[PDB]
């Protein structure tokens with residue numbers, strides 16, 4: 001077909017992108033911000049220097065025997081503790 | 088800090104009008120509200136045929152044939 | 157394809173051929189039938205939805221305001237935040 | 239009809255006359271007008287016939303009923319023929335492809351001249367059958383033939399009056 | 403024996419105007435709004 | 451530094467007070483299956499896996515311990531959430547098939563214009579119906595909060 | 609030595625239309641595009657076919673699509689440059705041959721509005737021209753100058769989609785010209801007929817019509833006024849008015865008309 005940069009099809013697409021993308025990104029960002037606001041209040045990430053010391057403290061406070069608790073490292077900076085005897 | 092009564096009718100009524108007005112506006116006043124009618128008229132109206140094959144008819148037809156009706 | 161060449165067109169209001177115009181009228185009835193049925197959702201939500209903090213609300217009215225008349229001393233800072 | 243409502247002849251005359259001009263004044267060419275309105279016309283037409291039954295010999299209501307019935311006959315007949323023309327035009331459009339480029343072009347109509355011959359014959363039948371509704375026939379079917387004449391070169395009596 | 407040709411869609415080549423583009427944006431305002439609501443709905447369900 | 455993820459306090463109580471396994475009902479299985487995946491950039495929301503654990507544990511119906519009562523209330527809230535997920539799929543399928551059959555004879559442009567919107571609207575109607583039939587519209591704020599308490603929380607030292 | 613690309617289509621062969629490029633020396637050619645087309649036909653390829661008559665721009669027969677924008681070749685200026693000049697018939701029209709379009713539908717639509725003065729009383733004997741003040745006559749200035757070239761008709765996207773239901777910018781402009789005219793006494797009848805969703809309200813205010821008008825008329829402005837007048841003046845009895853006029857046209861010959 002005959003395609004031209006100044007065509008209505010291409011120019012409309014550029015006009016739509018310029019007009020809507022700035023609005024959509026702002027609108028999406030605002031929603032993301034609201035989600036972050038609730039997330040941090042419900043469960044804020046907290047950093048611990050040494051996992052082992054924190055894990056031992058956690059077991060002591062909750063009265064959990066470390067033997068029955070499985071510790072795994074999901075990521076480099078993420079370590080997760082799970083119940084070994086869980087259905 | 089300890090009033091005997093609290094006046095709520097004014098504030099509540101104002102909110103009702105503001106919320107009702109906005110909703111009733113968007114649903115009644117604008118011409119943009121008839122955008123879907125325009126799109127259908129522009130691109131969908133009278134653009135139909137019965138002599139061209141379409142998947143929904145083919146799918147129904149094959150299933151009926153498969154089950155012997 | 158080859159469209160049929162022996163179509164018996166409608167001659168009057170009582171001798172009618174089935175055409176897409178009639179089928180469109182059937183669509184109009186069905187889409188409007190959906191609108192009647194789908195109206196049950198918004199009506200159902202308004203009729204069934206409740207907004208209560210907990211089960212104590214009903215117990216409070218049963219014991220401290222059974223007639224919806226018992227006045228309560230107002231202390232604005234409670235619900236005003238400051 | 240099953241109804242307990244009662245109307246005087248003056249009311250019956252008004253209802254029949256209102257329906258007659260509503261149908262005749264409507265633009266039949268637009269398909270959506272007939273789709274949306276015909277369900278309302280039929281419901282009213284059933285009521286009008288019931289109340290005007292004792293006045294079929296009346297010197298005023300009688301002629302209105304005959305014109306009303308004749309107009310409804312013509313409306314259905316013209317709609318059916320024009321509905322077929324729309325299908326032929328839609329088939330031709332889809333045969334062009336995507337963006338008229340033929341990218342996903344469908345199969346063309348192999349008997350287009352035969353269809354044009356069939357449609358024009360039906361068009362002539364309407365003119366003879368409804369001599370008092372030519373303005374409406376030309377609006378719906380006559381204009382439809384002119385659109386088809388652009389796609390295919392065929393001859394019909396009124397072709398020259400449509401600038402062909 | 404003679405047949406007339408049908409041209410392609412003008413959208414591919416016809417020259418654009420500033421007012422014409424804006425009118426399309428005016429007509430697409432609601433479409434974008436539905437799109438954004440869908441994106442937020444999906445994010446609320448699949449993210450964090 | 452490092453982040454440590456540990457079971458939440460309410461999760462600990464559930465493990466301590468569970469008496470046996472709880473059978474997963476048919477609608478609960480389908481509901482969990484149809485629940486969308488939840489990527490976890492951060493941890494603040496219950497996913498399908500956490501809900502399964504909640505529904506798997508069994509508690510004593512007659513226990514009068516306040517802690518056990520909270521566990522039962524949390525489990526019921528999660529159950530209503532899970533079974534409500536069954537309404538999404540029927541709405542989506544009806545949202546696509548019914549308009550598509552209606553517009554079968556029309557051109558492709560119409561199907562592109564109409565089907566995407568009808569599909570989303572159908573899913574929305576299904577989700578409303580599912581949540582409504584799952585008794586979610588009558589839950590108190592207390593019950594809803596318990597059903598939404600996270601199962602995993604970042605550990606806070608001291 | 610400008611390069612001209614011309615849309616070509618042979619109705620007898622019915623082959624796929626293609627663009628053929630010609631080289632012309634602008635030194636020995638007139639400034640306007642139509643001059644280049646005539647020179648090409650005279651010298652290189654006499655088979656090329658196109659409608660031309662006036663050379664002044666008044667008749668409006670040489671409407672074409674030059675570089676994507678509709679215009680009259682006789683008033684359009686040749687713009688030399690490296691990029692070849694592309695000449696095509698009017699958009700979304702059935703090409704009869706080469707650049708000659710098929711505008712029969714446009715003529716049929718124009719005849720529909722019945723563009724002739726209508727009065728309830730015939731000219732009484734001994735009566736001279738109908739009275740019309742300068743102020744009233746001034747209202748027609750921007751509307752009676754249309755040459756019916758159809759540049760605006762084929763530049764309206766709404767006309768691309770519904771050519772057989774939408775009257776288009778040119779026919780709607782003429783309809784309002786008779787509505788606005790003070791001498792005409794059938795204003796309500798004309799407004800009632802034009803008050804149709806397809807006929808009039810397919811105009812979406814795109815304004816591709818005013819931009820390409822060779823004579824500088826403003827069809828968009830006139831279409832907007834007609835909508836406002838119809839909305840304010842609508843009465844429940846308009847549908848009956850249309851029907852009665854249709855009955856008055858019962859004995860007319862075949863062709864488009866008021867109905």
Ligand SMILES: CCCCCCCCCCCCCCCCCC(=O)OC[C@H](COP(=O)([O-])OCC(O)COP(=O)([O-])OC[C@@H](COC(=O)CCCCCCCCCCCCCCCCC)OC(=O)CCCCCCCCCCCCCCCCC)OC(=O)CCCCCCCCCCCCCCCCC
Pocket residue numbers: 113114115119120121122123124126127128131132133180181183184187188191270273432433435436553562563564567568570571574
């Ligand atoms: C996100 C989820 C939702 C998505 C959409 C879901 C879609 C399904 C909805 C189901 C509900 C019912 C749908 C309509 C039922 C049928 C009505 C009907 O026939 O009436 C005659 C109907 C006109 O009825 P009407 O009620 O007199 O006119 C409505 C007017 O708006 C005059 O209206 P009014 O004066 O009464 O004012 C009230 C107005 C009030 O309207 C509004 O409130 C505004 C809505 C504006 C539209 C928004 C969506 C725009 C989308 C455009 C299309 C997409 C373009 C492509 C984009 C993607 C490209 C990849 O209400 C409406 O417009 C109608 C509401 C119901 C349908 C529209 C629902 C829109 C939902 C939008 C939700 C998001 C809102 C965000 C807002 C953001 C704010 C900043 O005419 C036609 O049918 C014309 C058809 C032409 C083509 C031929 C088709 C064949 C004809 C044979 C019969 C076929 C019947 C079925 C037609 C549809 C086929 C697909």
Ligand SMILES: CCCCCCCCCCCCCCCCCC(=O)OC[C@H](COP(=O)([O-])OCC(O)COP(=O)([O-])OC[C@@H](COC(=O)CCCCCCCCCCCCCCCCC)OC(=O)CCCCCCCCCCCCCCCCC)OC(=O)CCCCCCCCCCCCCCCCC
Pocket residue numbers: 109110113433434436437439440443444445446447448485486535538542566567569570573574577578581
């Ligand atoms: C004055 C102005 C006023 C204006 C008012 C206008 C109002 C308009 C309203 C329009 C409707 C919006 C309703 C939004 C409800 C959701 C929010 C909500 O309620 O949140 C609280 C709450 C949900 O929050 P929650 O408690 O946290 O629960 C979590 C969710 O339930 C969890 O949800 P879930 O798990 O149950 O489901 C998640 C959901 C969300 O969906 C997803 O999650 C989707 C995920 C997608 C993943 C895709 C992955 C793909 C992977 C690709 C990989 C590629 C690799 C490439 C690699 C390359 C390598 C080089 O899924 C779906 O919906 C189904 C799937 C999507 C189907 C549709 C797909 C087509 C989209 C069509 C778009 C149409 C626009 C076209 C735009 C065109 C632009 C040109 O809601 C509910 O529980 C009830 C939900 C239903 C409420 C519906 C309310 C409807 C109200 C209608 C009012 C209409 C008024 C207008 C006039 C009348 C018109 C008829």
Ligand SMILES: CCCCCCCCCCCCCCCCCC(=O)OC[C@H](COP(=O)([O-])OCC(O)COP(=O)([O-])OC[C@@H](COC(=O)CCCCCCCCCCCCCCCCC)OC(=O)CCCCCCCCCCCCCCCCC)OC(=O)CCCCCCCCCCCCCCCCC
Pocket residue numbers: 147182183184186187189190193537540541544545546547548549550551552553568569571572573575576579580
């Ligand atoms: C265990 C498994 C097995 C057993 C299962 C259970 C069995 C139970 C049996 C007893 C109960 C039966 C229930 C009723 C079903 C009856 C269906 C029926 O009769 O259909 C009639 C109907 C034909 O009638 P028609 O009127 O002429 O229609 C023509 C076409 O349908 C053309 O139609 P269209 O093109 O116009 O499009 C249709 C569409 C047009 O609309 C659309 O397409 C658009 C739809 C809306 C747009 C948005 C979509 C979103 C959808 C959301 C879905 C809901 C979500 C929420 C719920 C989620 C789940 C919780 O219409 C609708 O969608 C309208 C729906 C209206 C809903 C009304 C609901 C009523 C509620 C009543 C109240 C509740 C109950 C009472 C209690 C009340 C308490 C207060 O048949 C079909 O629809 C079939 C179409 C497919 C053809 C193949 C199948 C038929 C066979 C044809 C063979 C032909 C052979 C020819 C051979 C010739 C050569 C030899």
Ligand SMILES: CCCCCCCCCCCCCCCCCC(=O)OC[C@H](COP(=O)([O-])OCC[N+](C)(C)C)OC(=O)CCCCCCCCCCCCCCCCC
Pocket residue numbers: 101102103104105106108109235236237
């Ligand atoms: C005859 C004269 C009649 C005059 C009538 C006048 C009508 C117009 C008046 C406007 C009324 C507005 C009422 C809004 C509702 C009340 C506020 C509310 O609920 O917020 C408090 C609520 C209360 O929250 P809360 O629960 O935290 O409140 C407790 C407060 N503390 C914590 C301090 C103790 O706030 C929120 O929930 C936060 C979100 C607020 C969202 C506000 C919505 C605004 C809507 C804007 C619509 C605009 C439409 C037009 C846009 C055009 C753009 C070009």
Ligand SMILES: CCCCCCCCCCCCCCCCCC(=O)OC[C@H](COP(=O)([O-])OCC[N+](C)(C)C)OC(=O)CCCCCCCCCCCCCCCCC
Pocket residue numbers: 198199202203204205206
């Ligand atoms: C002559 C004009 C006729 C115009 C007719 C217009 C009809 C408009 C229809 C609107 C329907 C809106 C429904 C919303 C959903 C409500 C569901 C619900 O919960 O309802 C029960 C509840 C009952 O309240 P409740 O306090 O018992 O609690 C129910 C439970 N909760 C609290 C959870 C909701 O509320 C209502 O009844 C809602 C109001 C219904 C109003 C419907 C429209 C009334 C139209 C009156 C017309 C007057 C004619 C004037 C001339 C008379 C001449 C004799």
Ligand SMILES: COC1=C(OC)C(=O)C(C/C=C(\C)CC/C=C(\C)CC/C=C(\C)CC/C=C(\C)CC/C=C(\C)CC/C=C(\C)CC/C=C(\C)CCC=C(C)C)=C(C)C1=O
Pocket residue numbers: 130335336337338341411559562563768769
């Ligand atoms: C049919 O003609 C038309 C009309 O009738 C005249 C209209 O009225 C209208 C107006 C109608 C409207 C405005 C209604 C709304 C219309 C919309 C939203 C647009 C509808 C049309 C479409 C979506 C176009 C249809 C889809 C397509 C053309 C597909 C687009 C994508 C394409 C072409 C990409 C495909 C590319 C390939 C397959 C190439 C693959 C490449 C490789 C394999 C290379 C590999 C390389 C290596 C190194 C391995 C239009 C648009 C029209 O086109």
Ligand SMILES: CCCCCCCC/C=C\CCCCCCCC(=O)OC[C@H](COP(=O)(O)OCCN)OC(=O)CCCCCCC/C=C\CCCCCCCC
Pocket residue numbers: 105106107109110207
């Ligand atoms: C700077 C210019 C900005 C212009 C834009 C302004 C936008 C203003 C905000 C959006 C207005 C549209 C209506 C928004 C309604 C939001 C209601 C809301 O807060 O939902 C929560 C609210 C309160 O819940 P709680 O139990 O008290 O708290 C639990 C935690 N969520 O929940 C509900 O009641 C939800 C009810 C959902 C009904 C869905 C159907 C609604 C249909 C009608 C739509 C009306 C839209 C327009 C209304 C007017 C808006 C001003």
Ligand SMILES: CCCCCCCC/C=C\CCCCCCCC(=O)O[C@H](COC(=O)CCCCCCC/C=C/CCCCCCCC)COP(=O)(O)OCCN
Pocket residue numbers: 477533534535536537538540579580581583584585
């Ligand atoms: C036309 C195509 C249809 C395709 C199938 C669609 C099926 C849809 C089913 C899934 C969606 C439903 C909503 C999601 C579920 C909501 C949560 C839920 O489970 O709701 C129930 C309540 O909701 C319901 O019960 C919803 C029922 C929906 C179906 C209603 C119709 C029932 C009659 C069916 C007749 C079938 C006839 C078959 C004939 C066979 C012939 C061979 C909650 O109550 P519970 O506390 O779990 O316990 C209740 C009882 N103690």
Ligand code: SF4
Pocket residue numbers: 668753754755756757758759760761777778781820821822823824825827
């Ligand atoms: S308005 Fe201008 S472009 Fe349109 S037909 Fe009249 S003179 Fe030609």
Ligand code: F3S
Pocket residue numbers: 763764765766776777810811812813814815816817818827828831
């Ligand atoms: S370009 Fe077309 S949409 Fe109206 S403003 Fe002109 S007639």
Ligand code: FES
Pocket residue numbers: 659660661662663664665666667668669670680681682683
């Ligand atoms: S030849 Fe007539 S306008 Fe140019």
Ligand SMILES: [K+]
Pocket residue numbers: 786787788789790791792793794795
């Ligand atoms: K006048």
